[PDB]
Design a protein around this ligand. Structure first.
Ligand SMILES: Nc1ncnc2c1ncn2[C@@H]1O[C@H](COP(=O)(O)OP(=O)(O)OC[C@H]2O[C@H](O)[C@H](O)[C@@H]2O)[C@@H](O)[C@H]1O
Ligand SMILES: [Ca+2]
Lengths: 739, 322, 47
């Protein structure tokens, strides 16, 4: 971009909009900016603008090059710079007070060409070189896009416009700028009629207010011929309306000049539209690309877009990636090489995740450890080292919902297959990083929780519509194993994720009840179940409908409209009868253990004491079967992570300690054994109490234990200081000095 | 909430364990241990049915998503933005159309009223390449010649073109050229170029035309070869075809002849030309000679020849005549 | 606004065009060449 705008009076609104826009087009691409080097006016203006940006980034990236071209004989203190020795850092004296001819450099630039023709008194000779330079770095390679911007101006602006546009490097003219720019903005019609010396003289009297007496007839006719030669090429020029709040800044002007150049070009349709789009993504102008290059006539292929859309996905451009996937980018072809996925996780921006991930780094196969730690570890691991089903949509949505780009994450989900699984897995990993976020970040954390709530609502919406569509297919859908997303199932994953508003849905409660009744019916009440638990052959006599009989009657009816030992064992394999029968056995256990704690407690163990010994061997055998069906020490670590089984382990180790102290002969350890057995009794009764109220979770139990031990400790501490100080004051009153 | 979770965990534990409580689980675990998955919670589906199942799930998702988009379009927090954008477009279009909104018609009517009373009482672009400021291969800038100053029919006063011939009467028709003298032209007069008809019937020769054309100029696309020959006859053009590139049966037609534009046109010297174009696709006497310049081919298209108005008119004549 | 727009569009040249055509013609031809009655008397019941 070259800016070729000594005396210009722009008002502050346009100057501020132009400063901000030219910085926002400086920081984007890594692009060169070319200017005449004199510190008078707009060259110093863009020098101050690029100085303010290069302080604002702290020289961390880019260092935008401002190469300048200036005439040798017009500069001020060149004899301080005229040594035949090289590489020496010379000092320049700006001083703001040069002579009327010799202006000075702007020191906010960085590179300087000084062109030397020996004229020593005129500004004009230098330019004939400068536009030639533009063509050279247009000839360097596809070609580099080239564009000049034009503001207020004079005679120098008109000559550099003319010597640019005769070399096919197009130019943009800013409206509302004053001297020459508003002249070319007024000439927007009548290519034959407007070019008269009279109309140009009328306009140059209308705009060039103060300098109008400096005109001569040779200069006005050279001007009129130059502007007639300029305006006769209407496909390289563009007048450009002012930077307004109605979605127009200099990025739109630069794009439209690039396209009105490349439209009527000879051979731009084969290769220029690539770098056209690759620039168009960097400024996030969705409507211009949507209305200009994604037209009906282009008829591209889908694999060629795969660079460009990648950048639109590497920097959180949601509306633009929707435009890409609507125009023909297909996610299945996108993720073919796994190196693209490695690049995606390489270019992952800053979040809580990669901060937690680089600790494990100090590799896509490396990601699965942080995944399965953030998820429940009971799943399989995924993302294997070499293609564990590939499934691109799951990978894309996983990346998205990890990096927390929300409006990108909806696009990640709507393309995915296996909907309810991925929705709830996103909910689980969100709530896991919500809890595990230790560095405060309270707005970040509440956005995390809001996102997890959103996806839980999405999952119950999809499943509610599936359940209103069919019934038994939805029951087939809940218990499904998933090829994708490892080895989990939906109901388990929602149960472990504690998604409180999903498991209290009507259909999933119906499936839970239909498991919990088992082979019996789901319609009979529970008191008839207790009465069937009373009498053993009354199951032959009771009403007590079954799954088999119910379905048979039901199955037969639909068709018409359209056109001893096994049975009692099947009763016996219910979970409800197993539960009631087990808790009655547990009550009998409490009764006999409370009997022989007190009465039949001789030195040698008694008859019923041996019965209590064999029921506790029975309980430890049932516990070891529980461990045997649901590495090996990893299975033990997953076993102890419950709340009921830690109580049963503590109970059996305390019982075996009390029993092995009941073998002894001393009376003190005999009493100690009685003490251990009694406290073990109340541990068992507390386990029966917690068989109803408490759950299997340990997390919020640990947190509640900490926060209530805190309050009890604190109130006991202030109670202790009040107790101790009152007691010692009473001792200081009601006794003498001696004690 | 917690009642459902307690019910779930209760359903989760006791589904696994067998019957016969610890008084007889000492029996039952022993006979299971000496004996030797579950298809209710976690079941493995066969791949025959998972495809239909996932497709039905995706169709249900599509239905839900369409329903949510439609009922998101109904809330008033969206209708307010819709009416805002529509009123913005309406006010912009109303200002634009009122800016497009009879005096001339009234004047015409007045003229009709009058003229009638009187009756009752009774009874283009110039040669712009010649105006290009830098004359080629020369240190001479021409004078600025505007578009109203083109022809000699009107007079602009301070018009002093510096005469400049190359040291190796007339007026320029159709445009003031800003420089006098022969320049890079040989004579101080209308040097005539001639052009031999180079064409052939292209592939799919029904309404087509190819031509053996030369790209030795290191310039834009292919033009047919030729040369400025001796003016005034056609056997000199035959000798020019023999020289720059016998044959008896031929003719010459579609002769564009006259003033041709250049960046070398001066006040008194200019270029004029005579370009012809006419022609089985063989042309055996034309395929007899092998043409040497390496850049030269058979241009089978007629896409305006990618050159000046002479070559564009030459391509238009072969596109119209055949 | 909608009521006034319907009313004003209902107030919205053929006659003018016809007049113009007549002017075009008539000119060519020229070139070629060179109240209430007495209502009380109508009252139905004669007094
Ligand atoms: N390179 C220069 N450095 C300092 N002052 C200059 C320069 N050129 C002209 N002036 C002063 O401009 C004043 C006239 O004001 P106006 O006509 O509105 O600006 P212009 O059209 O002349 O700018 C032409 C330059 O701008 C572009 O960068 C081109 O490359 C040119 O180098 C005179 O007093 C000059 O001293
Ligand atoms: Ca257990």
């Amino acid at each position: 971009i070259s800016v070729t705008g000594k005396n210009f009076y722009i008002k502050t609104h346009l100057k501020d909009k132009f400063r901000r826009g030219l910085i926002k087009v400086a920081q984007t691409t890594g692009a060169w900016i070319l200017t005449g080097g004199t510190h008078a006016g707009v060259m110093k203006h863009v020098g101050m603008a690029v100085r303010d940006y290069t302080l604002s980034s702290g020289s961390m990236e880019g260092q935008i090059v401002v190469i300048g071209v200036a005439p040798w004989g017009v500069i001020h203190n060149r004899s301080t710079l005229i040594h035949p020795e090289g590489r020496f850092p010379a000092y320049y004296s700006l001083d703001e007070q040069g002579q009327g001819r010799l202006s000075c450099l702007d020191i906010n630039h960085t590179h300087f060409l000084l062109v030397d023709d020996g004229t020593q008194g005129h500004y004009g000779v230098e330019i004939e070189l400068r536009a030639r330079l533009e063509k050279l770095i247009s000839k360097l390679s596809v070609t580099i896009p080239v564009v000049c911007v034009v503001l207020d101006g004079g005679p120098g602006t008109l000559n550099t416009i003319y010597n640019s546009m005769l070399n096919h490097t197009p130019c943009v003219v800013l409206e509302g700028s004053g001297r020459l720019a508003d002249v070319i903005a007024h000439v927007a019609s009548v290519p034959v009629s407007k070019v008269t010396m009279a109309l140009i003289n009328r306009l140059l009297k209308r705009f060039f207010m103060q300098e109008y007496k400096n005109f001569t007839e040779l200069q006005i006719i050279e001007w009129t011929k130059k502007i007639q030669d300029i305006l006769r090429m209407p496909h390289l020029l563009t007048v450009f309306r002012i930077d307004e709040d109605k979605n127009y800044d200099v990025d739109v002007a630069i794009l439209q000049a690039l396209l009105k150049a490349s439209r009527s070009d000879e051979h731009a349709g084969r290769h220029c539209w690539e770098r056209q789009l690759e620039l168009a993504v960097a400024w996030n102008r969705v409507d211009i690309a949507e209305s200009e290059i994604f037209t009906e006539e282009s008829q591209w292929t889908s694999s060629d877009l795969h660079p460009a859309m990648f950048s639109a996905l590497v920097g959180d451009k949601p509306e633009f990636v929707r435009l890409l996937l609507e125009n023909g980018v297909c996610v299945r072809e996108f993720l073919e090489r796994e190196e693209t996925l490695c690049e995606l996780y390489s270019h992952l921006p800053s979040c809580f995740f990669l901060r937690k991930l680089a600790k494990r780094v100090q590799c896509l196969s490396h990601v699965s450890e942080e995944v399965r730690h953030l998820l429940g570890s009971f799943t399989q691991p995924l993302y294997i080292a070499s293609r564990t089903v590939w499934d691109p949509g799951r990978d894309l949505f996983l990346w998205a919902v990890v990096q927390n780009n929300r409006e990108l994450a909806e696009i990640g989900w709507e393309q995915c297959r296996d909907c309810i699984a991925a929705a709830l897995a996103a909910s689980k990993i969100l709530r896991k990083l919500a809890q595990e976020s230790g560095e405060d970040d309270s707005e970040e954390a509440t956005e995390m929780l809001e996102l997890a709530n959103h996806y839980e609502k999405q999952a119950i919406g999809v499943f509610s519509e599936c359940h209103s569509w069919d019934a038994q297919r939805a029951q087939k859908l809940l218990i499904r194993i998933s090829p994708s997303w490892g080895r989990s199932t939906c109901l388990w994953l929602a149960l472990e994720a504690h998604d409180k508003s999903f498991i209290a849905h009507s259909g999933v409660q119906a499936l839970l009840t239909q498991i919990w009744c088992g082979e019996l019916s789901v319609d009979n009440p529970h008191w008839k179940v207790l009465l069937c638990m009373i009498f053993f052959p009354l199951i032959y006599t009771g009403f007590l409908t079954f799954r088999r009989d119910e379905d048979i009657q039901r199955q037969a009816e639909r068709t018409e409209q359209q056109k001893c030992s096994s049975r009692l064992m099947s009763f016996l394999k219910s979970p409800q009868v197993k539960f009631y029968w087990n808790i009655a056995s547990y009550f009998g256990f409490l009764w006999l253990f409370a009997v022989v704690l007190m009465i039949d407690f001789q030195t040698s163990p008694s008859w019923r004491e041996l019965l209590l010994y064999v029921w506790l061997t029975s309980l430890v055998c049932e516990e070891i079967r529980q461990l045997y069906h649901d590495g090996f020490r990893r299975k033990a670590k997953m076993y102890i992570k419950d709340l009921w089984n830690i109580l049963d382990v503590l109970s059996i180790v305390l019982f075996i300690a009390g029993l092995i102290c009941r073998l002894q002969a001393s009376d003190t350890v005999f009493y100690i054994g009685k003490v251990i057995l009694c406290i073990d009794f109340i541990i068992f009764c507390l386990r029966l109490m917690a068989i109803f109220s408490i759950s299997r979770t340990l997390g919020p139990k640990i947190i509640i234990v900490r926060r209530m031990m805190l309050d009890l400790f604190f109130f006991m501490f202030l109670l202790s200081i009040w107790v101790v100080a009152y007691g010692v004051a009473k001792q200081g009153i009601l006794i003498e000095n001696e004690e | 909430t917690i009642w459902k979770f307690q019910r779930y965990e209760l359903i989760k534990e006791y589904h696994s364990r067998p019957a016969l409580p610890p008084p007889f689980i000492l029996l039952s675990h022993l006979i299971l241990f000496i004996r030797g998955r579950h298809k209710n919670f976690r079941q493995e589906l066969e791949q025959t049915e998972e495809e239909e199942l996932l497709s039905w799930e995706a169709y249900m998702k599509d239905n839900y998503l369409a329903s949510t988009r439609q009922d998101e379009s109904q809330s008033v927090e969206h209708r307010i933005h819709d009416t805002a954008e529509k009123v913005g477009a309406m006010s912009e279009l109303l200002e634009r159309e009122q800016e497009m909104v009879x005096x001339x018609x009234x004047x015409x009517x007045x003229x009709x009223x009058x003229x009638x009373x009187x009756x009752x009482x009774x009874x283009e672009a110039p040669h712009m390449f010649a105006r290009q400021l830098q004359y080629p291969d020369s240190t001479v800038r021409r004078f600025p010649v505007p578009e109203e100053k083109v022809s000699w029919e009107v007079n602009f006063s301070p018009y002093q073109p510096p005469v400049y011939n190359q040291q190796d009467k007339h007026r320029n028709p159709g445009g003031r050229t800003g420089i006098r003298g022969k320049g890079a032209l040989n004579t101080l007069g209308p040097n005539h170029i001639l052009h031999p008809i180079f064409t052939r019937w292209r592939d799919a020769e029904h309404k087509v035309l190819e031509f053996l054309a030369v790209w030795e100029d290191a310039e834009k696309r292919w033009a047919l070869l030729g040369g400025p020959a001796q003016p005034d006859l056609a056997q000199v053009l035959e000798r020019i075809l023999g020289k720059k590139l016998k044959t008896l049966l031929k003719a010459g037609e579609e002769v564009y002849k006259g003033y041709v534009d250049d960046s070398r046109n001066t006040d008194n010297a200019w270029v004029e030309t005579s370009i012809i174009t006419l022609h089985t696709p063989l042309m055996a006497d034309l395929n007899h000679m092998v043409e040497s310049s390496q850049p030269l081919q058979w241009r089978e298209v007629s896409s305006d020849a990618c050159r000046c108005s002479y070559q564009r008119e030459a391509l238009r004549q072969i596109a119209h005549h055949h």
